[PDB]
Design a protein around this nucleic acid. Structure first.
Ligand SMILES: [Zn+2]
Ligand SMILES: [Zn+2]
Ligand SMILES: [Zn+2]
Ligand SMILES: [Zn+2]
Ligand SMILES: [Zn+2]
Lengths: 49, 586, 134, 585
RNA sequence: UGACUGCUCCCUAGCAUGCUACUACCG
RNA sequence: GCGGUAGUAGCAUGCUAGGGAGCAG
């Protein structure tokens, strides 16, 4: 196993790193959509007369 | 969520948790930071702590990767994988890691609690993202400083200019004067509204509110704080001197009121930045207004530490320039308001480091370089990427009040990254046009620090004074009161009633809170003084300590006189130099 | 501007169904169970054909968030359920969360208030607004 | 998904690091990838490790995950290296033939176009190499022009002058009108409508083609287009028919062009003929003679410009009826006597710019030397005709090579057909020297022209010889010399009848200095042929390889009907020229 | 510009489990 | 001669996930 159960970690580490890659993206898309929603609100109120 | 680390500039996702400002750190580079400190908590997209329900462990190497989680050994599943290993802590981009062999520079800044002058020798003699981290750490820990103190409850009100005031429990007390200006706000039944800008001094509580208001019961004050967010541009760009002043507009006609000015501007358009040797009242406020006419086509960036300092830049603003071409952004503070306000796309935009918005302009002119540090130094360039740059002022007039520096005060010379430059590269400009003080004081300040450099203005009418005294001082809370010299003050001020047409100068301005009741004489703040002055100023230095008679602090107080200041130099610090009229002490 | 019509519904009930011996709650918020809701919404269905159709739909209100005035929906006036008021409405809010940003971008209040009037003569359904120029 | 260049087998890979990204064949693509840094290859999807957020992009550096391509740092246990077997993994992996020596192809691809060796490659290559080469030149040069600042007119002083700066960090475009800008103006948001401009010695002298008056913030750059690939060859595999069948033998003829009819007769017995066309040898007259000889021809008149086909349209309606000519001018102000926007037209003149694609009768191409292999294949990609003719001569004028640095390329390999009249020989010739007399013509015949062009007329001793030196001092993108400019009036003074001439000069800013001294008009050296006076004053103002090389201002000497001026400060060809010499005052 | 459900087929991946064979160690 | 564990491959079933599609209200 000094070569065949660890190799199984070179699996788990890869998977965990991929998952947290994905979650970092998912948290950047969130901030982007938040900026978008709030700038829409603040640009549509200024029409309010 | 994910950026480039300081010590590496590789793209990382790890922020030192125990570290104050939490900068992005690179895997190998983060490990180097974690191996030498107690900064032993690191946050990635999620914090690296054992998420077994209700645990305690929070050191990084203390944890192992348990699948979807991070655990301690007391929790780790049989299949684990230590997070901190391989000489490289586990995070995103684990391949692109370069580190620095000696990061104890970085750890030293991070483990710097800012007590000694060594701390600011670190803050300057560091490297760069170190420099912004340093300035920002100073600010952060000092706005955390101010609020370790009580809530200033005005709980009875007696008279005007006086309050009955207590504070919260367990906390020491903020000092006596207005570098620590409060900004309290009032409640109703539920939450917290408006009061204003206040400070409390020797009463009985003397409050000097900037705006008009009358206070009630339960009225409380604290030094309300903000959120110092990080800083981008460098303190100063990697500058260089052009080959011709191309892109800049050579004008035909000139005003020789400032003949000490035009030869000074000509290469400034042939160069990125010039910080000038600006001795007090050497037409420095006049200086930047001369180029205003020389290059009236310049979107020239007038900035200072305040619209009490850029106030001086706006002093002769419309007096020299047409009106609608000046503007200042005052955010939602009462100072100068002759201009049109809230117009950034303006030909001449004056402002303070507080709130001029971010644009691109022509030539920067920065008043107040000594007292401002590396933080707001990078602010104007983070504000603005201009044609060229100028800093007006001088490390030869004052530093900032260092709330946490405790051992010996730092050099005049390392005030900031550019302040060393006129002491390691030399002065980029100079102005010896002494329109203010005469042969009285000026060269005696030239034989002081100024290179034997500033000539006489005028005759020496023997009006700035010498008195060789001693005095007796006793201490209190955050001041020092001495009347053996205060007794000398009227004793000085009496033998000619023409004496007392002067402004009292004094370090421990409560010593004027005792003097104002004796004389009626106005007050002079020692450090917030330059720009303001009379020909006649009475000064009781009332202390000889490192607080007091150090080289360049009340240096700003001696040069206040057009012709006639008073100096009861109870110090042997620099008295061995000063060349003025001496008399017997009655 | 009138939207309540709670006294009018009671006067109608008393004029036509005087001896119907079962409590009539004009606003179905006061109903006791789902059968009482059906009972009283039945009457609201009839009595709402009398009142002007511009008085139904969200009841907006000018709130202040970050010192700026929004117009947001703090209730509703159903033809079947009467007037319903939101319970957690707050006027001076410092900043919005994700959830509040959501529930304010979804309301038709800010959208309709900031659009052109619309008179669409192709249909008979009560048009409200034209969120565009064409 | 098409056929690869070096193989013509149907492939799906396109070299990613390569500039123009041609289709490459699996084995053939591997051959290209083994010898360059062109180490990125795109198939239907790009061959790069799609593990979330990686860096690796070399091809052999990757292995076939299943639905993906990974590096070793990402590859799943079950992998399969993409680049192996001597054959890179793509569609049609079976039909691959390659070429044993493709360093021809790699050499074109790794060619950054600096030396004349680059264009020796561009011509002495093989075919789809040839179109790839010309198209690579164009691509990298329209990428060239925009490495430069945005020409902001940021103050306006007077007319014919501007206050103008540019963007940051960029060097500056040169001085004259081979690099014509076409700026466009903004409002608050986006970019709409200025025009065609160029900036020269002022103070910024702008020579706008159309009428307009500029404002503040007004900016200019050399707006670019998208060079899309070519199709037809530069020239078909041609052959000479057995009789001029399908072509219409006419009974009557005009012997104004008796130097013409024996020239056309076999041209209908043949596909293409490029003609030896010396300057003003009735070459513009030549193609108009066949116009009457075969008035039944849909004959394809094309040139490098409606400043050059301008000359083809000079005697167009003067010789042909009106409604049978047409020129397509796309949505540029030049000739507009014709009906415009009519391709189905008996006579269609145009430029390589925008004559649409059809099939016609006999091609006649002005400007063959300055145009290269790109637009050479354009007219045949435009048009598959009966037969072909190219008017002009490599004995005129090449193109301005923006990237050629070391040692200008031969007159002889201007293009694929230009070698032919130097390896096969001239298909036609015209020695009908209607223009210059015995003065210059044979002295240009003993130059490069085979001792071939006869005298027109007497030798009135009006083209001149001056044995001088001058002193030159440089600036941005010009060269200014007044020891010869001082000679100019010094030449021009002793008879005020001198100065009824057009100034010739290489560094046309040297006329921006001369025009204020004389009032004399300007002559561009290279954009000159077709235009001329009997009287032209010329200060060559330089003897460098820019200057007194064999066949550049060759076009400037032959401008005179009878009387040009040549202050030959050069020892380059002065050892030849046989004209009137005097002392230098 | 693409709604809410439900079912079904096909392809791939993962994991465990389950089944069978080959080899190895020890009792 | 047996047991056991460990390995590896083959094979199956199932569950999850990802993708492509079809029908229905
Ligand atoms: Zn730290
Ligand atoms: Zn734990
Ligand atoms: Zn009810
Ligand atoms: Zn390539
Ligand atoms: Zn990879």
């Amino acid at each position: 196993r000094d070569a065949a159960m660890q190799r199984k970690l070179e699996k788990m580490a890869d998977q965990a790193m991929t998952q947290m890659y994905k979650q970092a993206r998912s948290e950047d898309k969130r901030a982007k959509v938040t900026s978008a929603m709030q700038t829409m609100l603040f640009t549509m109120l200024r029409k309010l007369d | 969520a994910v950026g480039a680390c300081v010590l590496c500039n590789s793209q990382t996702s790890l922020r030192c948790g125990a570290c104050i400002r939490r900068p992005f750190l690179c895997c190998k580079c983060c490990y180097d930071h974690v191996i030498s400190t107690s900064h032993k908590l690191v946050l990635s997209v999620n914090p690296y702590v054992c998420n077994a329900p209700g645990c305690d462990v929070t050191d990084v190497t203390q944890l192992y990767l348990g699948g979807m989680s991070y655990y301690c050994k007391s929790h780790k599943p049989p299949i684990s994988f230590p997070l901190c290993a391989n000489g490289q802590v586990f995070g995103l981009y684990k391949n692109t890691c370069v580190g620095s062999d000696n990061v104890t520079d970085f750890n030293a800044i991070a483990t710097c609690d800012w007590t000694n002058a060594g701390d600011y020798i670190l803050a300057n003699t560091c490297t760069e993202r170190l420099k912004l981290f340093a300035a920002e750490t100073l600010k952060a820990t000092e706005e955390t400083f101010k609020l370790s103190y009580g809530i200033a409850t005005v709980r009875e009100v007696l008279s005007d200019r006086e309050l009955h005031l207590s504070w919260e429990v367990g906390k020491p007390r903020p000092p006596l004067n207005r570098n620590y200006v409060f900004t309290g706000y009032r409640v109703t039944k539920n939450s917290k509204v408006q009061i204003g800008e206040y400070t409390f001094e020797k009463g009985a509580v003397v409050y000097r509110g900037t705006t008009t208001y009358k206070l009630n019961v339960g009225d409380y004050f604290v030094l309300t704080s903000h959120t110092v967010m990080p800083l981008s541009a460098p303190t100063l760009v990697p500058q260089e001197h052009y080959v011709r002043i191309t892109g800049l507009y050579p004008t035909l006609n000139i005003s020789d009121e400032f003949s000490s000015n035009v030869a000074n501007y000509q290469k400034v358009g042939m160069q990125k930045y010039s910080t000038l040797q600006g001795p007090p009242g050497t037409g420095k406020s006049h200086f930047a207004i001369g180029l205003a006419l020389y290059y009236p086509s310049a979107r020239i960036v007038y900035t200072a530490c305040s619209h009490a300092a850029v106030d001086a830049l706006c002093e002769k603003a419309l007096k020299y320039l047409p009106i609608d071409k000046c503007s200042r952004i005052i955010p939602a503070v009462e100072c100068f308001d002759k201009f049109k306000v809230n117009s950034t796309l303006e030909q001449y935009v004056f402002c303070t480091v507080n709130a001029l918005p971010e644009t691109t302009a022509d030539i920067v002119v920065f008043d107040e370089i000594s007292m401002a540090t590396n933080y707001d130094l990078s602010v104007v360039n983070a504000r603005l990427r201009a044609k060229h740059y100028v800093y007006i002022g001088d490390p030869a007039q004052l530093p900032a009040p260092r709330t946490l520096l405790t051992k010996g005060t730092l050099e005049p010379e390392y005030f900031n990254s550019v302040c060393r430059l006129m002491k390691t590269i030399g002065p980029d400009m100079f102005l010896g046009t002494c329109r203010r003080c005469p042969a009285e004081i000026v060269d005696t300040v030239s034989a002081l620090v100024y290179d034997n450099k500033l000539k006489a203005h005028k005759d020496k009418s023997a009006q700035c004074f010498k008195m060789f005294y001693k005095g007796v001082i006793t201490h209190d809370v955050s001041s020092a009161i001495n009347r053996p010299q205060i007794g000398v003050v009227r004793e000085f001020l009496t033998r000619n009633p023409a004496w007392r047409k002067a402004v009292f100068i004094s370090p421990y301005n409560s010593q004027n809170a005792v003097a104002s009741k004796i004389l009626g004489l106005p007050t002079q703040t020692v450090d917030s003084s330059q720009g303001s002055e009379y020909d006649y100023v009475i000064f009781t230095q009332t202390t000889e300590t490192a607080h007091s008679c150090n080289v360049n602090r009340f240096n700003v107080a001696i040069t206040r006189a057009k012709v006639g200041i008073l100096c009861i130099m109870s110090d042997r610090d620099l008295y061995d130099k000063l060349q003025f009229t001496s008399l017997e002490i009655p | 501007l009138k939207y309540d019509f709670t006294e009018e519904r009671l006067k109608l009930f008393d004029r036509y169904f005087k001896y119907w011996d079962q409590t009539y709650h004009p606003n179905c918020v006061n109903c006791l169970d789902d059968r009482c809701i059906l009972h009283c919404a039945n009457f609201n269905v009839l009595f709402s054909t009398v009142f002007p159709p511009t008085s139904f739909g969200p009841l907006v209100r000018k709130i202040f968030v970050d010192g700026v005035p929004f117009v947001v929906s703090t209730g509703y006036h159903f033809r079947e359920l009467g007037v319903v008021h939101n319970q957690d409405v707050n006027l001076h809010s410092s900043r919005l969360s994700f959830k509040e940003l959501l529930v304010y971008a979804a309301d038709p209040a800010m959208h309709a208030a900031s659009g052109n009037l619309l008179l669409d003569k192709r249909t008979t359904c009560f048009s409200v607004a034209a969120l565009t120029n064409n």
